Design a protein around this ligand. Sequence first.
Ligand SMILES: NC(=O)c1ccc[n+]([C@@H]2O[C@H](COP(=O)([O-])OP(=O)(O)OC[C@H]3O[C@@H](n4cnc5c(N)ncnc54)[C@H](OP(=O)(O)O)[C@@H]3O)[C@@H](O)[C@H]2O)c1
Ligand SMILES: NC(=O)c1ccc[n+]([C@@H]2O[C@H](COP(=O)([O-])OP(=O)(O)OC[C@H]3O[C@@H](n4cnc5c(N)ncnc54)[C@H](OP(=O)(O)O)[C@@H]3O)[C@@H](O)[C@H]2O)c1
Ligand SMILES: NC(=O)c1ccc[n+]([C@@H]2O[C@H](COP(=O)([O-])OP(=O)(O)OC[C@H]3O[C@@H](n4cnc5c(N)ncnc54)[C@H](OP(=O)(O)O)[C@@H]3O)[C@@H](O)[C@H]2O)c1
Ligand SMILES: NC(=O)c1ccc[n+]([C@@H]2O[C@H](COP(=O)([O-])OP(=O)(O)OC[C@H]3O[C@@H](n4cnc5c(N)ncnc54)[C@H](OP(=O)(O)O)[C@@H]3O)[C@@H](O)[C@H]2O)c1
Ligand SMILES: Nc1nc(N)c(NC(=O)Nc2ccc(C(=O)N[C@@H](CCC(=O)O)C(=O)O)cc2Cl)c(=O)[nH]1
Ligand SMILES: Nc1nc(N)c(NC(=O)Nc2ccc(C(=O)N[C@@H](CCC(=O)O)C(=O)O)cc2Cl)c(=O)[nH]1
Ligand SMILES: Nc1nc(N)c(NC(=O)Nc2ccc(C(=O)N[C@@H](CCC(=O)O)C(=O)O)cc2Cl)c(=O)[nH]1
Ligand SMILES: Nc1nc(N)c(NC(=O)Nc2ccc(C(=O)N[C@@H](CCC(=O)O)C(=O)O)cc2Cl)c(=O)[nH]1
Lengths: 286, 286, 293, 283
Amino acid sequence: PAEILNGKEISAQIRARLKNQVTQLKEQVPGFTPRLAILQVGNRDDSNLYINVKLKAAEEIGIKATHIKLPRTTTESEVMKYITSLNEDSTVHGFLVQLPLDSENSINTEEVINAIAPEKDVDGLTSINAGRLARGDLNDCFIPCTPKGCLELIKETGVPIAGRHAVVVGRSKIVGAPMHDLLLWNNATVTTCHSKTAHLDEEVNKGDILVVATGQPEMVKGEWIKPGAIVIDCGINYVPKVVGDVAYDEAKERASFITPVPGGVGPMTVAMLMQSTVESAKRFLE
Amino acid sequence: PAEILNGKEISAQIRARLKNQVTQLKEQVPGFTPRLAILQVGNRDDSNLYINVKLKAAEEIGIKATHIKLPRTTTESEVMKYITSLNEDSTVHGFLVQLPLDSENSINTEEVINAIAPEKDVDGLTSINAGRLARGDLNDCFIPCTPKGCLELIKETGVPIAGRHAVVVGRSKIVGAPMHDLLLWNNATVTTCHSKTAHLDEEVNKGDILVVATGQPEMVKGEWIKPGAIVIDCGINYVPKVVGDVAYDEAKERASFITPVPGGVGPMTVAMLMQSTVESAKRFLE
Amino acid sequence: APAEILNGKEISAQIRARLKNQVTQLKEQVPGFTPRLAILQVGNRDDSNLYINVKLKAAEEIGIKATHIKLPRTTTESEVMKYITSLNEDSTVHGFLVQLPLDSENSINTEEVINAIAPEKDVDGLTSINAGRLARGDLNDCFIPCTPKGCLELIKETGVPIAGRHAVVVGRSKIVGAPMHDLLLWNNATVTTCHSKTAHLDEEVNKGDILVVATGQPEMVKGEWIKPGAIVIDCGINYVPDDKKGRKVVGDVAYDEAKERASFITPVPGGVGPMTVAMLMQSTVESAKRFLE
Amino acid sequence: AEILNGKEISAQIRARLKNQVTQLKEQVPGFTPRLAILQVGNRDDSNLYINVKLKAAEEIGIKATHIKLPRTTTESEVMKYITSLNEDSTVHGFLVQLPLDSENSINTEEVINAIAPEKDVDGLTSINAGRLARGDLNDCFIPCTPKGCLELIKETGVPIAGRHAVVVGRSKIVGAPMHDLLLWNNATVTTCHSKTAHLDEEVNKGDILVVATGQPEMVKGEWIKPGAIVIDCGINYKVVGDVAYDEAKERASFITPVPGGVGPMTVAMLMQSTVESAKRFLE
Ligand SMILES: NC(=O)c1ccc[n+]([C@@H]2O[C@H](COP(=O)([O-])OP(=O)(O)OC[C@H]3O[C@@H](n4cnc5c(N)ncnc54)[C@H](OP(=O)(O)O)[C@@H]3O)[C@@H](O)[C@H]2O)c1
Ligand SMILES: NC(=O)c1ccc[n+]([C@@H]2O[C@H](COP(=O)([O-])OP(=O)(O)OC[C@H]3O[C@@H](n4cnc5c(N)ncnc54)[C@H](OP(=O)(O)O)[C@@H]3O)[C@@H](O)[C@H]2O)c1
Ligand SMILES: NC(=O)c1ccc[n+]([C@@H]2O[C@H](COP(=O)([O-])OP(=O)(O)OC[C@H]3O[C@@H](n4cnc5c(N)ncnc54)[C@H](OP(=O)(O)O)[C@@H]3O)[C@@H](O)[C@H]2O)c1
Ligand SMILES: NC(=O)c1ccc[n+]([C@@H]2O[C@H](COP(=O)([O-])OP(=O)(O)OC[C@H]3O[C@@H](n4cnc5c(N)ncnc54)[C@H](OP(=O)(O)O)[C@@H]3O)[C@@H](O)[C@H]2O)c1
Ligand SMILES: Nc1nc(N)c(NC(=O)Nc2ccc(C(=O)N[C@@H](CCC(=O)O)C(=O)O)cc2Cl)c(=O)[nH]1
Ligand SMILES: Nc1nc(N)c(NC(=O)Nc2ccc(C(=O)N[C@@H](CCC(=O)O)C(=O)O)cc2Cl)c(=O)[nH]1
Ligand SMILES: Nc1nc(N)c(NC(=O)Nc2ccc(C(=O)N[C@@H](CCC(=O)O)C(=O)O)cc2Cl)c(=O)[nH]1
Ligand SMILES: Nc1nc(N)c(NC(=O)Nc2ccc(C(=O)N[C@@H](CCC(=O)O)C(=O)O)cc2Cl)c(=O)[nH]1
């Protein structure tokens, strides 16, 4: 059976390294501290949970994180005002808008996201940062935090990515599409699948590397997995318990390496956000 | 044998149609013309040819196209003076920098391209337009002209794209990477290959749709082709004669539809540029 | 448990020291004489710039005059052919090579260019003449490609006789894999050659008492495949993206597992790489000595 | 075990070549393919083989001249004849029958490598060998015995790519070019020779097996892999091959008899290359 990729343990190493890094910055530049802001619209329970998890990690590391929660009935004009203020506040080094917005009024998510200054866009969701990533200009952009965490998990196997066939199932702005770009510029041959893909099972079977981000619980069957594959399950699905987008039991029999759910991608996503935040803070000093 | 996709004929139809739009807009808004500018650094032979073809097309349609040719000794800051000037000239509706820059100095191509105002970026090469396309926001952006042209050639076959498996060989900023995005958001399942892909022949054979943009003369062999494939060949190679990146003679015995070289993608690239220029002229009027 | 390391960095240094002393003696025995190598480059590929510079530095340390001729990517075939003719006829140039691949805007027939090199100056062993002599076992009338030369020296460093053993070569390229097969064969190994159309590569690899890998596919050859006790020679130099560095160099062999199965193994970097350069200097010195005779 | 009948197969190649030579003569009147065979000494085996080749050329319509130099020929005298055959625009291909039988010490390598590669229809020059051994198969002459062996293997209809082939013998004229030829048809190839340990086990790996050792019936049928394609190049004097034919026939799926197997194919491939050098000259 597969080696388990323990996201809980790996993310802990990353947070301790960031913690010590932040401590050293404070020693070298007294009074300085990385500052994150999280903006939310509405009151979705899962958004509440994930934001709380992010605040706890910021606090462990010594990043000052402020959470601003606007009600369901806010207007796009109201959110734009807050984004402008965060852009202009020079003590805020990065900030993000937790998605999806949960609003009674139609609010243009792409307009809201794209008002974020690219230098503070630690979620890497602006068009500017996406376009840098999608075209291989990887050193001047924030990369979205879940693809970053997935990449670090793949690298924990010690198997080089270059030349491997990687399959990404899902193409969302937040996970699937940036994952494809990250694997491409790590020199994998990449196939991207979606809801219009036919013969998904045969596409999945091509992947030496498989990243699944669909939101469909255990829809990717273990019998489809290429023997020896590295399997990265981004799913967090609540069912009659938490399960991933991959059928874990059968997949684990065939994979060389696999992420458990929970304790896999989830903690790595949060740790990567903290890493990007520390990076913007260091960039701000210089 | 495959039906020939005749880009030379298809483009003529597009250009004749564009001329009618331009004539119609000239009488509906008197004294108004679409205005294009093409900036060149250095004196490459192929760049000279391609710029000349674009000027020819713009002349036939009624677009006022200017060609600024800077010497090989141009600095990055001299280039930025022209880009800044073109952004600010309200009479210029779109402009592009022919690539690659041929300068004996070192010029950050990315810094130059990304100084172009996005609403004049008729080549779709800025990060902003690339990020929109790469995230599926296809109604807000300029799409690179060679991908635009390849999509039109594919539609001319009448075979729907949704659910087919598309293989793109090459990932360049100008062609291969935007070709992947355009096919993906037309709901193909897409594999991208490059110089590090292993078993390229096996990977090419999965493509119901095959777009080759490698700059390697006749490198993709006909034996590799999936029987019945739609074969789109972007290569323009001068060999001991002009050949594409696909071995055309034997690929024709396998494809259901194939683009010749010359007379395939090339003229479509130019027509699609004139289309985007007219689109930004109409956009400017509102 | 772990395999002994074939330290190409140390071994190549012993070779260059030896060549240094014997070029210092040649410059005394025949005053005013300097062994001279030319490197012809078309284009400006970044990896080619590094390997050329690494070769020039080795030449300079030993006392070889090495001339880098870099033609722009606009160069035509007939223009390259004029340079090669010029180096063929320049009697102060004892060896020269064309760094491959050529990086030109124009298509240049690489075989035409390479085979125009005079075989007695073909210190890279790339002409069809030198390849034909090697491939038919006529080893003392030819220049052997530098990477296979370095690999053979690394193999002999083990102290393990080659005759009788089963050798597996993964890769059949003109520069490395095919001349490697010939060199092992005429050293009396039984030799199996693998490539991209080999089925059960893992089983074929498992046959190799001697294993030479030259595929350019990073760590594709799994350690689990390695025959226990094998001598493992890794020719791979693969630059894999690495945002913690911005890349790193890895071999064609998964070293961390392979070294628990092999008796001897080359690390990457520091293995075949420096030996390749040391062998070029050795062949260059040999061609200068042959010029005097 | 099916029988690869070189005598029948070669007859078809010679008939195909014959008509091909007839059509060529009708298209360019007064033009015929011309071969020259040079011999040093008077070995009986070479007299026989050269005669068999001359006869094949006559059946097809190739004009072949045989020049036989004495045992006391010098290297210099042989070189004069090669220079003349190179410079004779009438001659499209020529070969030197090997081994040279000379009282004097003559460098065979030197003699062979003075042949112009465009006329080297035996493929024995270092130039043609280096093209073949590096996979540039499109512009060289492949030695005739390996050419014929490959034709025999293809006659089975079993594809070569991905099969494991074993070659026993590494000689300049058969074994070494035979390895190259199978390799660039994408077999995985093992070469064995007189220093190969456990030759029995090695031979057992071959889906394709070519034996070119000159050791009468040394390869035992018990060694053959069941279903193997067995190609026997041996001509050992009764005449028998290098494979124990009776036992090997109970294991192989296809097998060459000796005589009537490779032997006829070798001669037909030389004629094929001669006709081919005549076409290249016509342009
Ligand atoms: N920290 C973390 O672990 C983390 C972070 C973010 C998200 N996630 C999780 O990842 C999962 C997906 O998230 P998302 O943001 O990517 O959501 P999303 O916007 O709903 O995207 C779903 C994607 O999956 C595709 N898909 C749906 N059904 C499919 C099917 N039957 N076959 C193939 N593709 C199919 C959709 O295809 P179309 O494009 O054709 O609709 C779409 O591209 C969820 O469980 C989410 O919580 C986890
Ligand atoms: N109107 C038109 O028809 C039109 C318009 C624009 C361009 N083009 C043509 O499209 C072609 C593009 O090539 P270029 O060199 O000019 O651009 P380039 O920017 O050098 O891109 C070459 C792409 O092909 C890949 N590639 C190179 N060798 C390969 C191989 N052996 N196997 C697989 N992939 C390989 C490269 O991979 P890496 O990324 O790994 O290096 C890269 O992604 C040219 O012929 C160009 O003229 C045509
Ligand atoms: N000093 C040194 O260390 C040194 C010097 C020179 C070169 N090199 C290195 O040697 C490596 C290869 O270079 P090269 O010129 O030999 O490369 P190449 O021309 O790209 O050839 C690679 C060979 O490997 C084979 N191959 C590819 N994938 C395979 C697979 N999955 N299974 C089996 N065989 C496979 C190919 O098979 P096909 O033949 O069927 O295509 C081909 O023969 C590179 O890392 C290069 O930098 C190192
Ligand atoms: N027209 C035809 O059909 C035709 C044409 C030419 C030749 N032939 C025949 O083919 C046979 C071989 O000819 P050749 O020119 O190749 O002869 P050769 O030059 O004597 O070569 C014999 C090869 O077999 C190897 N060998 C000898 N004993 C061996 C053993 N016990 N185990 C393994 N390998 C062994 C030798 O190995 P070493 O290299 O280690 O000595 C050598 O490589 C002869 O019978 C010859 O007449 C037939
Ligand atoms: N702007 C914006 N909008 C978004 N929707 C996202 N997505 C997002 O935050 N996802 C997300 C983040 C963290 C977890 C998580 O915490 N998982 C752990 C359990 C707790 C632990 O970490 O200890 C586990 O599974 O083990 C799970 C998820 Cl789905 C974003 O990133 N940016
Ligand atoms: N900024 C920027 N930089 C770039 N380098 C490009 N690329 C580009 O212009 N390519 C390009 C454009 C046209 C042709 C062509 O005209 N081909 C015709 C022959 C003439 C005809 O009849 O039209 C044919 O093949 O038949 C061929 C090519 Cl390669 C770009 O688009 N933007
Ligand atoms: N004509 C022609 N064309 C070619 N492309 C080649 N190949 C070639 O030069 N390869 C090559 C050479 C040297 C290195 C290297 O620097 N290796 C060392 C580090 C420093 C050291 O050399 O000491 C290490 O890995 O530790 C790496 C490589 Cl890939 C050729 O030989 N002839
Ligand atoms: N330059 C050079 N030198 C060389 N020594 C060779 N070798 C060579 O000719 N060998 C050779 C050739 C033909 C036969 C033969 O006659 N075989 C048939 C019988 C009748 C028929 O040929 O049809 C059979 O056995 O059935 C047998 C052999 Cl050993 C060469 O090729 N080139």
